[PDB]
Amino acid sequence: MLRFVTKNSQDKSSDLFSICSDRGTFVAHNRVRTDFKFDNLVFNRVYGVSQKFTLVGNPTVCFNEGSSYLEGIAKKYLTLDGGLAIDNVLNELRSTCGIPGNAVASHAYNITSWRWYDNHVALLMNMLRAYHLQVLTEQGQYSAGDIPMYHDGHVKIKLPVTIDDTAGPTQFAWPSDRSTDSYPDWAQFSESFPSIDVPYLDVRPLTVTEVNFVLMMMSKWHRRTNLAIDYEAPQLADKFAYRHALTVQDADEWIEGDRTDDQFRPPSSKVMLSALRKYVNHNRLYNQFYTAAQLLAQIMMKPVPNCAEGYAWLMHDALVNIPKFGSIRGRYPFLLSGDAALIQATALEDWSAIMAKPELVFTYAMQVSVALNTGLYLRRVKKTGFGTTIDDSYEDGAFLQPETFVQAALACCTGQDAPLNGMSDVYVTYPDLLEFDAVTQVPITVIEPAGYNIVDDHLVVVGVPVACSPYMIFPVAAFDTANPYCGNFVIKAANKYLRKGAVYDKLEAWKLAWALRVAGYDTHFKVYGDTHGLTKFYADNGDTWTHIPEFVTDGDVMEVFVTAIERRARHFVELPRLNSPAFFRSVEVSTTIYDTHVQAGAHAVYHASRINLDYVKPVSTGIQVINAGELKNYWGSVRRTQQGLGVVGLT
Amino acid sequence: MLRFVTKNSQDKSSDLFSICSDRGTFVAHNRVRTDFKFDNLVFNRVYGVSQKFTLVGNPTVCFNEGSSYLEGIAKKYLTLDGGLAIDNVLNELRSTCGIPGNAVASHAYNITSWRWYDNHVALLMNMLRAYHLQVLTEQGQYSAGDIPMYHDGHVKIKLPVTIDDTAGPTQFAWPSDRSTDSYPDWAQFSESFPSIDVPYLDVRPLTVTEVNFVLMMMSKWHRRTNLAIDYEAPQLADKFAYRHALTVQDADEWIEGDRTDDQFRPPSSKVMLSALRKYVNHNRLYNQFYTAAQLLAQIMMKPVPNCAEGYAWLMHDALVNIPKFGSIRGRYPFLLSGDAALIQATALEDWSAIMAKPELVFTYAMQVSVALNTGLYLRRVKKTGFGTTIDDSYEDGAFLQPETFVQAALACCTGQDAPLNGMSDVYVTYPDLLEFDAVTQVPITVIEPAGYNIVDDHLVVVGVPVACSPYMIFPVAAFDTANPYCGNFVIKAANKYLRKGAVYDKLEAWKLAWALRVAGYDTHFKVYGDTHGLTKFYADNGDTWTHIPEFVTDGDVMEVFVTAIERRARHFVELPRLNSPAFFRSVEVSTTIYDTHVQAGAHAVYHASRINLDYVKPVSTGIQVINAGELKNYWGSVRRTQQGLGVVGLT
Amino acid sequence: MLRFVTKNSQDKSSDLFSICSDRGTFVAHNRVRTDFKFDNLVFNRVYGVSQKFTLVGNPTVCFNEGSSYLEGIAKKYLTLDGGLAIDNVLNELRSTCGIPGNAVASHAYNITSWRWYDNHVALLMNMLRAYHLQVLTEQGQYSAGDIPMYHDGHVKIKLPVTIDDTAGPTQFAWPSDRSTDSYPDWAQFSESFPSIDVPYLDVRPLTVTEVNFVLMMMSKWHRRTNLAIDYEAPQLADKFAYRHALTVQDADEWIEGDRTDDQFRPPSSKVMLSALRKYVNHNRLYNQFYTAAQLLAQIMMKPVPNCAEGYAWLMHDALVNIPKFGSIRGRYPFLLSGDAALIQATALEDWSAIMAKPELVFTYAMQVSVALNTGLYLRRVKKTGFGTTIDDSYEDGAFLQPETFVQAALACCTGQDAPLNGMSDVYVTYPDLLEFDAVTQVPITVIEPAGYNIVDDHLVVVGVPVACSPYMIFPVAAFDTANPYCGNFVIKAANKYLRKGAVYDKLEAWKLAWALRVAGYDTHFKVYGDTHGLTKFYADNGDTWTHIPEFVTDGDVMEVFVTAIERRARHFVELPRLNSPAFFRSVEVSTTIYDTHVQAGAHAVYHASRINLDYVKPVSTGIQVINAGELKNYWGSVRRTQQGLGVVGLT
């Protein structure tokens, strides 16, 4: 994930922005300068482009079974090919247990040394989400979510929320609620020989507050806010025992009225980070934490569209496949004694980067939301080749299996090799949006129709619409040729001229429309075919980006006529008559970014924290690390090729 | 058998599905994409296929004693063969323990006329089926179970059910009755040496509740549901005694009516599995457990037939040979000690795998059911000469041996090495299915004669019909040549064209018809006989599989006249006419299954889990492992050789 | 550990100091000469430095059972691992002693469910602390013990004490109470074979009074003084039995009140040590005794801080993991016979050394305390990058493992191979000290704000402060480069001079400031921040050590502006100004400690004794010695490698 965020060490460094939101949303401001090269002279314009991101969401969880992983075991027990040496783990118990006779191995295999279902990624989800919520809490920004009330005088949209924004809590209370629901049974089991088949976790190097936090968050999660991360989650395990030298019972007392909320307020974000770092470093959970970060980032937030038709993508809900929690590392103290067993290098470097800066996960999530939303429309277009490909040889099979859905979308949008989940049966997916013809309905209020194909008072949207500017992944290089996405392009003459002298293919017509809307001239396009009532290219005043109209996507018509270019009231840099001969000049448009920052409303400016590849140096002290990986465990990167996109290892 | 289930998926993504039932049935949805590449114009079509299954069955059980197996004792008590070194036992009694010479001499004189009959296969059968029933009950769907009600709108067929679901129980009742049926005369044994030739059990490592469950489940088992694994079975031993530290009294009060039902509930599935694990790994019953697992898998369930005529497969009832219960492990306490001798490697690894994941047995049962049906059907088909040039004596070659019946069926189906029972005189058989003229009078209530072989108010079939489709096991190489059963097939030019259309061979015509029905074209055909009421390639929806046309089941029909190729009501991919010599093209297809997730009924969806075989190495400590097998015991595999399927060693 | 204490003085003049206390504290005077050689003009100054210590502490003890160690029995009763050859035990019972076959068979049947948990570490802990307390009492200075009352004339700080000295006892009272607390149910055992799984002790070689002391000291131990080694501890075993020739009755009358206090006095220190020696060398408990000695040393005492902020180090309380008491040596009389097996060489030599001189433990405790504090502080410092070019992950590298916590601290401090505990799941830890932001609210009563980080009426610290000075262990090579911690350092030219003075690096400035404060010049400095109330290099008298200036604890500060070099009130050696480029000279210093003699308070002076290691060879007769160690048991050493400190074998 770190390599993708840093765009392969571009300028040797990268950047990230802190998590922050107001009423469940936050703008993402920018400043850009767009040049103009014609008449062997330069014009330019500077304009502040914004972008709206919302944290609201209602994903659906599935705490199903998942494959067990034993990577954080000593080298002497695990093997690259032999794996778990059951004889080696068993006979070590005999040398240390007080159980007599030769039936020691039989009893141990009967009771506890048969399951081998070590997997804590659900717990890592819980704790990392808790850290993010606590950040939003003490930053004075924790509240119920609220999708913005989109309004332009024309058709307007409003989506409902589970809980009221004002009725939402102003402080982060506990996930579970005391004296309402059951809690898992826990007890410090420090015996050398396990007695009952039950998940075991080693939290010896954790302080009392950290172990209290972990064992309390072990219980059921209850949603109290509309945020996409407050998803419902039951208690991960019905029963478990924690390997701690000291006995901790503050949570147990708080179950009864013994401890009030005052004396059991949730801890601080640095306390959560210390607990998580201690836990991961102790149990050698680098790959599992990397997978946890991937999963949480993929559900962090969605980009609020600036167009009326964009809300169709926003209204959707995702499905998460979190494996059932199971922990077998406290069953035997000697398991952790020794170097870690084949920890993935990408996981290690990513873990070190997150420890250096805990904001990398949020910045990656912010990038990935925009990247996925763009990549869905991008693959829908690229499958048909603007309706100019006969067969279906684009080979979009990487979008079929729900595991690689998001990663394939990322590899489609940007040429960067999207990072694999590093696990199996775990994913976030919108199955209804699998095929490129994704019809959907939008609930719509009562406004007068102005060429917006309103059907049954419900905006009918086909597929997925591009709903966010690419300004945070600007070098996207989505199309093969030059475009606003690439950043620098040159407007060319019309293909031919006729009685209104405007013959342009959809792609360069959209290029010219975006250039003119940047320059302050709205453009009128007219095709006598299917139009649905749009005569000018759709754009937003706050965000000068011009969304590609549907007729470019449908691939039926290949030409669009731009009859007259009108001048907006908010005039800007003057241009000649482009849509006429003997006056058009080969203008070229380039843009660069001036200032990028993330602000919640207009208050408490959050200066960006620079991150470079200097601290990327992993801690290799007693951690057997392998850079290579296997596709079986989904350790690779989906890469876009000439014919399409496929999954390959990084080599 | 783990090797078989892994090679079914060629060691890539070895899927397995949780047990789940809805009224005794369920359905396994898939998502398979089929290609159509011709003239470098690659097309494809994805579609969901649902091959449903039913757990309802009424097998016939014959409890006949067979060979006595003693391959779990220490080496020093066993000779070079299975012969028990009884003289060694008495010498060890003389040497190790200090017993009066008169006492040991009297015991040795008494033992000279004792039966060393030890077979716990029936006990393992009962315990495993009880565990599965408890799993199904705690899942909340256990009931009497009913055969599916299938109708095509032209014929309505409903097989009678012995016990209806409405009157069926909802909670798992005990196999026996409350003092209504006599219980076995169990007793407590704790001395060093046996006193009566009655078999004795070693159940010391088990807990009080597990011993209660085993002892009272030893009683006569009554069939209370139409479940296939709910076969009737008598008390496995009229008298016995368990070697335990203390006597167990809880079950006796319930037996005699002192304890009511609520005071004695059925134990959990987890504790049942723990008891089974303890018993097997304590008596070292790995081989007998492997045989019992094979029997359960082969007797688990049958596939619901999509077509009408396939219900004949549901009509037939299996016959089994369960050896009588015998136990000499509890006769002496030293026998189970030492290093276990004569343990098969395949049995050990299979036992480790099934205890690591208790769903391997169920997925192997599903695979064996579908493979059995396909193997029998394609055996009948290849008897004609369809697809196979060599007219091998498939009728009576190796299908006579009941122990090798199902394994030979699997060999004929897939070509993979079917795992043998590993035990003598134990098998599952359908005696009325060896003949190739097996007809059945399936009761029908015809709505209208859509065209079938309906005779005497209830139609008949020939041999074995088709009930399933090769989708749980797709890459099955039933035929040597390319076919839909294989991954991909290349449609070739017609043998001869003519004015009305073209004629086709036995296999090529069916292959093209299946490809066209997948594409969306319904294919008509004309045959020299008039033996049916429809000139169509029947292909029921839900799986889009075109059954082998019944006309080719008989011989002397090598050419089939195919005409009238046209689109159906719905259409997926445009294809050339393929019958006229002008429009014909060398269409090549390719099929691959991507996703599969069984779901019980219409609410409970059970996502496909996964198995990490790297972590499931067997517990090889303290075990004398033997890779080789003995053909008289049927410790081997059967492979479909080009010269005829036969039993071979794994070497 | 003897190797460690000898290498601290590089095997030359291995000093050691008698235990001595004054109100729970004492002070270790020294006489160290510091050189100043420049331009062949060698100067020097001798001065007495006093680094005082306190024995007062309140550690937290968690009595949790851990791994069972059996490495003291004869070879024939032990397998290749720690597994007890119980079958060998029963065969030897059969062969050697003439016991009825029925009796031995019954005993063998009973023994099958017995716990071979044997760990006498808690017992050795208790006996050693009792011996030390009796030594301190007979020395005539035992009391409740009070924390020192330190004030600089500007802030008055006094840590609260649980038990004041005035009400504190003057004579060593018994750990238990006169029938107020229940005593363990001891008994007399003399038969050949055990009868109950309750642990049994072999105390035959001990005398009647020693057995009385051990048996009644087995009871619950109450904390009656604020001594660090006076931790509360419950009864180590509710029931037990001692293998002795005759029963012991003297203690019982005192237990039941029949015997009054004067009739039963605490036994002498000499007889306590004799009893400990007999017990250890009879049960062959060398490894467990070495572990217990390590624990006592690591938990003995803390250094009184000269500076005000160092009292935060005294605020923190340790946490320990003492394994539960277990004894199987007394189960059978033959076990202790034969040749002892699995005895570590280091443990044997350390045991011989500590019994030759019972002060080695105390001097090693003092050294481990000072090394611990210095290691933690310089770890926090080197996290910034002070002195060390490589920014190794010192935060969480190997400090997570509690068993390796203090050893890693010692490795970071000195670079010498720290001796491991030699036992699993036993450690001393400060959980609130792993984090680098550990703050404490030390209660202060400010007389006047002389300039400190005083906030909220009670100042705070960051991480771990400094309380001691590297004078008990002078040649400590904490930093790779030359420094005051090393023997000598060469002051080099300034990086850049300027009109007001010169600027200096992070390390060179502190080195020069320390050298100048030793010389007699007070050095001022200016920093880009304003984070303190004094621009001075703080150096309290009594030790003439200049603490690391707190400004450099944080990062992003590489250059420090130093000016105003001038003589203090008193002066020792004339030095050039060293800041102006003209007066600057290449001053080179050299430091060496000559004399040291701890003295308790102001009256009792304990001259430094000596140890002749030539006469302290271990008793290797009748012992199977093993030089190698097993990393799971933590039988090794940790060395500060250039690539990061880690656990290595001694080979």
Numbering used by the authors:
A (entry chain B), B (entry chain A), C (entry chain A): 1 to 651
Authors' description from the paper:
S. cerevisiae, a genetically well-described system, harbors in its genome an endogenous virus known as L-A virus, a member of the Totivirus family, and its discovery was the main starting point of research on yeast virology. The L-A virus contains a single 4.6 kb double-stranded RNA (dsRNA), encoding for a capsid protein (Gag), and the viral RNA-dependent RNA polymerase fusion protein (Gag/Pol).
